[PDB]
């Protein structure tokens, strides 16, 4: 197992990146003809990071002041 | 004594029907205010979404 | 003449050119050096155009020189798109090389006149019971498949491909709108190996796509299906989603600068909605006949999407999570499903009398559920006990094994026509199965199988 | 070098500084003529910072030249706070004269890495029934007490203040948070006559605060407290109200000029918590047993502060206005609350099988409560009746008269200890005080004494 | 001095004058050549003002010179407003050419001062025996009037309008707030065919007109009111819609573009309530009694529109479409109708026990009807049965022919006094009147009334 940590205290940066870091770490496998299993503990955590960031850019919020672009996230 | 017996059942029966009905509507007027809080919440939440939207574009 | 990007925030551009040279609404542009394509959606002013990306930004920069195209997206059509899958520009998306166009249409246009809409009832059969029964369908009709998240969307149009596309002797067009990759693959090779694949072509935009694709996608299916429809051709024209292209426009309408409206959607639903809907019709050279699928958002059929889509329709077939919780399939709501051929003068007096009294049999139940509930079954009169057990085994009788479903499953497909349907219901209204058990009519196909079940 | 007040919107303060000499983020800066204390939030650009006042700005204008002090707010640590109540600045409030300090440490520090975490899993047994069955702390871990207004949080950190003190011989590090000034006179005095007072660092910034104040004072406490951490020391951290602290950020986010989120909060909302919250640790060095009672807002526990709470303690003990409107007190919630030490390989079988039983029959007997409520518990199955007949005994066998509610009530407060937890709640499960009132139950402590009661 | 129009969206205008001759905020103001009224909401700085249209903004362009007139909407007051009809700015919308006014008043003002109230509670005596008896009204008063249609809410506010005019010397004014235009026209005729058209002025600010003038009409016929109490006079302010009324003020709140409250209402909802509310008192020259008909959204009494009038509100009668069923014209609810009034401390401890006897008697015969209907009239002990005949009675006294209704009944009005009306109750309820039929206390005023319709 490889563990992929972006802790609460760490900048909301990281916490919304760490899922794609993990991502690619398993990609690495699935490309060279092996299988990979990645377990993503709080993707609603990763929305109210990406929330934070893009409030704080001033983004136009949307349905519970989430960002337009929260399903493509 | 068989048939008396039968009497106080179809009295009891009756009473209790009775019960059941207003104990329904207490439960009813209950849920009603439940049902208008919610409601005034569902209004106020939105109108903050739409004003903070335009507060933005 | 020639741009440079002045603002780039997610999907959305900012192009600015000569006041002179300003591109058109809805105009393509494209970037130098990167492969990108930018849309015209608004003339913000100063020789500035507000555009979305048809592709990622990440490689783009501030400054980068962008050309006008001097039109607007042009798609390749005909003959030529048959058995090849595409983007939403009309690349090739499959390793076929390149496709030999003899013309190409611009993905805007306006919808057929008043004076061009024709209007037909020839009756379609789908071999579906409860469709065949509450919801009949008609050649060159507009059909809607109205569900919440995971009810059966995909599953019921693909056993509507294979019960009519496979038989249709016209051409067929396949729009995948933000559906999953892995579904996109599964029915390519299902149409490859069915040798269907001749016979109908195939547009993907799923949900790895940036807003400006999952925006523009169900155009570029539409404007393939009215070239063939305007040369006197029966068309087939399946929507995967085609509320992706509602949200698609919700992602991008506050960078646009619109103010949002109630359920923080785009203040123009229903106009795009008019807009696209319009277009997808049967005029008098040739007949489209589409069926799509309507996702709802949280099963609430009173959100402004799905309530803005009812209007468009000529049969609508609801799926209802309830009924899916129970383990019955076709998820389909007998009470909210409805079709402008559910009509005597159409389908003749018996079997709209046994879809009313289907209706009414199943309306009853749902009042009586609650008495069961509180006070028990005892304390029910002889005709409504009578009446619970035909409404449970109406109930039942509605399920069907699917040729689609036989992975989920373990059984095999059925395929029951629309004489044993209505022969079937009649029956249990009738009382004809009163001694048969409730299990005997779950998943069966015409009622000789329930019969059969029922011994064992 | 010296800024000037350029604005002042209530407890936010803006000052202007040279280029070459603006201070950093989280600075302490003085007002030269009232020498009122500024904490840097942000820089704006030109010379200018935003910052949030550590006092009242009533009689500040713009003009007055301000003193950046080249580092954060410093407090004073070690065996000097010891017995001494002080401020958000770390300055004495109890008349008592200077504090005989021999270091101080900025009140901003990062949370201690990965590689300098501690896994406690020793149990800590608190007395009390509820709590030692279904939610078992343990030694340098975190517990919440959520609750609405008025249900108990601070009357169930009183005693567990009382019974925790028996065995723990270091030293208590306590924080009021935006609470009353009354409260925290009563605490002082009860340990002051009691002799307590020499082992306990008191810090206050109460109800009566400006926001500046109830936005730090949590910092302050936690850096005396982390100062014994770091000495090898076992720690109890108290914290009178966390929830105070983003309530405090929530009143000056807006004068920051940050966009809202859902229901009016700060967009920094889970990082301020988890920022204040990971500090609160047990490391290698020392372990820092915390205890913070948490403010539920109209009641709801899905409001945003309470669920962003949850995920950082390891015991949550969810107390209610309906059990508490019966008269039982505690009035914890077994079926919400729960703890990460309630494991086989933590407490044992027996435990464990006791705590999910009378889980198993609390959970049965609140799906009947609409049946009985409409029919009443006559038309019940005969099982169903002997459960609601067990559930109703388990829970009045969960209350527990206590030391620090003797002056409310008079009756004489009850120590429990785990074997007779155990016990009492595995022989009502059993049916082995089937023949006993229910009343018998009620306020009795030990279950000797239920059936020494039911001899009345 | 003159102004010019320099800006124009829907119903909102926003004016430019010269430095030295910005018009006040409420001033009125006159567009040149177009007969069109602005009122002024706010004053934006740099001379320029935001009004709202009372009229029309249709044809209007951006440079019209625009006159301040130096005060507020100034409207006639006096003798010469009875039995004409009246738009918000007084001019006669009947075609009966100009009012002969004699002076004008403008409509703001401040409520009368805290030395200006009247020393104690004196009752209006109406002339009705159910009003007076269990809805007394005190002088200065505001009563809410709750029912559907077709149930005699015109009919009693023509009997209320005759009465204080014939028994009291007053006069009457009503205000129609949202006033539907054909039920306008048809309340201006049955008051004429009554003859009570002389003693009311009629002010209508109509449905189709812009929100301006629907929140403003309440004011002129408030200032009309004013006037004739100043002369000496006890007057009624009818209002047509009080939530029609707070309901123009969310209008106007969100076109001047004003943050919304709770459930969407204007952030000044009570200040807008008390404004108009704390003119209607009884000072030391005379008394404005307010009848105001109200509506609750959704059914919900907990609404902020509900909520703020009930504050205000110091009777409530409620009119019963069961009870007009019965016969009873009047058809007022004697068990739902409330009066803070009914107080001993304020009416004394006989009119209070008597009202308060005949409520009881009704309650229990409520009761014992339902026991006769399931049960039969033979299961009744003597006692039962002895107040059911009391009550029959004191309901069918509770009836009273009206002098606008001779037309309806074919029978001369009574005006009935409080005297007459405590001594024949308290008769009825002692039992002085057992052996009179029920029919003989039937349309007939006072007690005596009664005796003799039995002789024959
Ligand atoms: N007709 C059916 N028979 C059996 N299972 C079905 C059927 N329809 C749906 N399901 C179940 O649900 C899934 C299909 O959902 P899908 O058609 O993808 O729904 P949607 O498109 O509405 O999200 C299958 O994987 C299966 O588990
Ligand atoms: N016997 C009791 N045991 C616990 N709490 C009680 C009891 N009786 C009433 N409560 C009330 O609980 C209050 C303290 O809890 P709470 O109000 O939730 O704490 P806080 O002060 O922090 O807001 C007490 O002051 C007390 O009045
Ligand atoms: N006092 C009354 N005496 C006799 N009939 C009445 C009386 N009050 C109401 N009615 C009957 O009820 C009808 C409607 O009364 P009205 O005052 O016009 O109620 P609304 O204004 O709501 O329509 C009258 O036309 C008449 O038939
Ligand atoms: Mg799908
Ligand atoms: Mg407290």
Same mark, same amino acid.
């Given at each position: 197992?490889?563990?992929?940590? %972006?802790?609460?205290?760490?900048?909301?940066?990281?916490?919304?990146? %760490?899922?794609?870091?993990?991502?690619?770490?398993?990609?690495?496998?699935?490309?060279?003809?092996?299988?990979?299993?990645?377990?993503?503990?709080?993707?609603?955590?990763? %929305?109210? %990071?990406?929330?934070?960031?893009?409030?704080?850019?001033?983004?136009?919020?949307?349905?519970?002041?989430?960002?337009?672009?929260?399903?493509?996230? | 004594?068989?048939?008396?017996?039968?009497?106080?059942?179809?009295?009891?029966?009756?009473?209790?029907?009775?019960?059941?009905?207003?104990?329904?509507?207490?439960?009813?007027?209950?849920?009603?205010?439940?049902?208008?809080?919610?409601?005034?919440?569902?209004?106020?939440?939105?109108?903050?979404?739409?004003?903070?939207?335009? /507060? /933005?574009? | 003449?020639?741009?440079?990007?002045?603002?780039? @925030?997610? =999907?959305?551009?900012?192009?600015?050119?000569?006041?002179?040279?300003? !591109?058109?609404?809805?105009?393509?542009?494209?970037?130098?050096?990167?492969?990108?394509?930018?849309?015209?959606?608004?003339?913000?002013?100063?020789?500035?155009?507000?555009?979305?990306?048809?592709?990622?930004? &990440?490689?783009?920069?501030?400054?980068?020189?962008?050309?006008?195209?001097?039109?607007?997206?042009?798609?390749?059509?005909?003959? =030529?798109?048959?058995?090849?899958?595409?983007?939403?520009?009309?690349? #090739?998306?499959?390793?076929?090389? !390149?496709?030999?166009?003899?013309?190409?249409?611009?993905?805007?246009?306006? =919808? #057929?006149?008043?004076?061009?809409?024709?209007?037909?009832?020839?009756?379609?059969?789908?071999?579906?019971?409860?469709?065949?029964?509450?919801?009949?369908?008609?050649?060159?009709?507009?059909?809607?498949?109205?569900?919440?998240?995971?009810?059966?969307?995909?599953?019921?149009?693909?056993?509507? *491909?294979?019960?009519?596309?496979?038989?249709?002797?016209?051409?067929?067009?396949?729009?995948?709108?933000?559906?999953?990759?892995?579904?996109?693959?599964?029915?390519?090779?299902?149409?490859?190996?069915?040798?269907?694949? $001749?016979?109908?072509?195939?547009?993907?935009?799923?949900?790895?796509? #940036? !807003?400006?694709?999952?925006?523009?996608?169900?155009?570029?299916?539409?404007?393939?299906?009215?070239?063939?429809? $305007?040369?006197?051709? $029966?068309?087939?024209?399946?929507?995967?989603?085609?509320?992706?292209?509602?949200?698609?426009?919700?992602?991008?309408?506050?960078?646009?600068?619109?103010?949002?409206?109630?359920?923080?959607?785009?203040?123009?639903? =229903?106009?795009?909605?008019?807009?696209?809907?319009?277009?997808?019709?049967?005029?008098?050279?040739?007949?489209?006949?589409?069926?799509?699928?309507?996702? +709802?958002?949280?099963?609430?059929?009173?959100?402004?999407?799905?309530?803005?889509?009812?209007?468009?329709?000529?049969?609508?077939?609801?799926?209802?999570?309830?009924?899916?919780?129970?383990?019955?399939?076709?998820?389909?709501?007998?009470?909210?499903?409805?079709?402008?051929?559910?009509?005597?003068?159409? *389908?003749?007096?018996?079997?709209?009398?046994?879809?009313?009294? +289907?209706?009414?049999?199943?309306?009853?139940?749902?009042?009586?559920?609650?008495? *069961?509930?509180?006070?028990?079954?005892?304390?029910?009169?002889?005709?409504?006990?009578?009446? +619970?057990?035909?409404?449970?085994?109406?109930?039942?009788?509605?399920?069907?094994?699917?040729?689609?479903?036989? +992975?989920?499953?373990?059984?095999?497909?059925?395929?029951?026509?629309?004489?044993?349907? @209505?022969?079937?219901?009649?029956?249990?209204?009738?009382? $004809?199965?009163?001694?048969? !058990? &409730?299990?005997?009519?779950?998943?069966?196909?015409?009622?000789?199988?329930?019969?059969?079940?029922?011994?064992?």
């Amino acid at each position: 197992t490889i563990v992929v940590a %972006a802790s609460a205290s760490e900048s909301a940066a990281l916490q919304y990146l %760490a899922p794609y870091s993990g991502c690619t770490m398993g990609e690495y496998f699935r490309d060279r003809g092996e299988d990979a299993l990645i377990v993503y503990d709080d993707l609603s955590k990763q %929305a109210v %990071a990406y929330r934070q960031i893009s409030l704080l850019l001033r983004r136009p919020p949307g349905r519970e002041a989430y960002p337009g672009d929260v399903f493509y996230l | 004594a068989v048939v008396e017996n039968n009497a106080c059942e179809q009295a009891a029966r009756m009473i209790a029907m009775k019960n059941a009905t207003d104990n329904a509507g207490e439960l009813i007027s209950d849920l009603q205010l439940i049902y208008n809080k919610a409601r005034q919440a569902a209004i106020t939440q939105e109108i903050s979404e739409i004003v903070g939207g335009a /507060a /933005a574009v | 003449s020639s741009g440079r990007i002045v603002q780039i @925030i997610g =999907a959305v551009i900012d192009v600015e050119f000569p006041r002179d040279a300003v !591109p058109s609404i809805y105009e393509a542009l494209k970037v130098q050096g990167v492969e990108t394509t930018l849309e015209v959606q608004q003339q913000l002013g100063d020789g500035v155009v507000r555009s979305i990306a048809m592709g990622s930004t &990440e490689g783009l920069k501030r400054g980068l020189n962008v050309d006008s195209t001097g039109a607007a997206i042009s798609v390749p059509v005909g003959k =030529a798109t048959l058995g090849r899958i595409m983007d939403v520009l009309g690349n #090739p998306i499959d390793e076929a090389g !390149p496709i030999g166009e003899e013309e190409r249409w611009g993905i805007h246009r306006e =919808a #057929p006149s008043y004076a061009d809409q024709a209007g037909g009832n020839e009756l379609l059969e789908t071999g579906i019971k409860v469709i065949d029964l509450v919801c009949p369908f008609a050649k060159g009709g507009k059909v809607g498949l109205f569900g919440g998240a995971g009810v059966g969307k995909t599953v019921n149009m693909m056993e509507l *491909i294979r019960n009519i596309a496979i038989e249709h002797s016209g051409y067929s067009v396949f729009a995948g709108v933000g559906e999953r990759t892995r579904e996109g693959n599964d029915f390519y090779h299902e149409m490859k190996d069915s040798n269907v694949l $001749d016979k109908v072509a195939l547009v993907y935009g799923q949900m790895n796509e #940036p !807003p400006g694709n999952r925006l523009r996608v169900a155009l570029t299916g539409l404007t393939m299906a009215e070239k063939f429809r $305007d040369e006197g051709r $029966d068309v087939l024209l399946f929507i995967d989603n085609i509320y992706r292209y509602t949200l698609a426009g919700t992602e991008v309408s506050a960078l646009l600068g619109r103010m949002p409206s109630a359920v923080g959607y785009q203040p123009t639903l =229903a106009e795009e909605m008019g807009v696209l809907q319009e277009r997808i019709t049967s005029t008098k050279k040739g007949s489209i006949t589409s069926i799509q699928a309507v996702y +709802v958002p949280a099963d609430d059929l009173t959100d402004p999407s799905p309530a803005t889509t009812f209007a468009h329709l000529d049969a609508t077939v609801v799926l209802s999570r309830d009924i899916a919780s129970l383990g019955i399939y076709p998820a389909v709501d007998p009470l909210d499903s409805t079709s402008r051929q559910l009509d005597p003068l159409v *389908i003749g007096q018996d079997h709209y009398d046994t879809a009313r009294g +289907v209706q009414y049999v199943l309306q009853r139940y749902k009042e009586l559920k609650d008495i *069961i509930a509180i006070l028990g079954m005892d304390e029910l009169s002889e005709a409504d006990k009578l009446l +619970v057990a035909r409404a449970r085994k109406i109930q039942r009788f509605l399920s069907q094994p699917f040729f689609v479903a036989e +992975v989920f499953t373990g059984s095999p497909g059925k395929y029951v026509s629309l004489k044993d349907t @209505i022969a079937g219901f009649k029956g249990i209204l009738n009382g $004809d199965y009163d001694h048969l !058990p &409730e299990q005997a009519f779950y998943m069966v196909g015409g009622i000789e199988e329930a019969v059969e079940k029922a011994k064992k």
